[PDB]
Structure 1
């Protein structure tokens, strides 16, 4: 009950920066996820050179 109360207090400070910020955060998050996927794909092709 104490941990839930602290986390809910911090989230309330970011939610105050508007929908536009949330859009940016969503975009950033999407891009980081694609970079992570491409790096992961390059690593898997090198192990296969027999």
Structure 2
């Protein structure tokens, strides 16, 4: 009950920066996820050179 109360207090400070910020955060998050996927794909092709 104490941990839930602290986390809910911090989230309330970011939610105050508007929908536009949330859009940016969503975009950033999407891009980081694609970079992570491409790096992961390059690593898997090198192990296969027999």
5+ long unaligned stretches in structure 2 = none
* RMSD (Å), alpha carbons: 0.0
Q: Please report the TM-score for the alignment, with normalisation by the length of structure 1.
A: 1.00
SS in 2 for 1:49: coil
Q: Where in structure 1 do 4 or more consecutive aligned residues deviate above 3 Å?
A: none
Offset from partner CA, 1:4-45 (integer Å, 9 cap, x none):
000000000000000000000000000000000000000000
5+ long unaligned stretches in structure 1 = none
Q: Please report the TM-score for the alignment, with normalisation by the length of structure 2.
A: 1.00
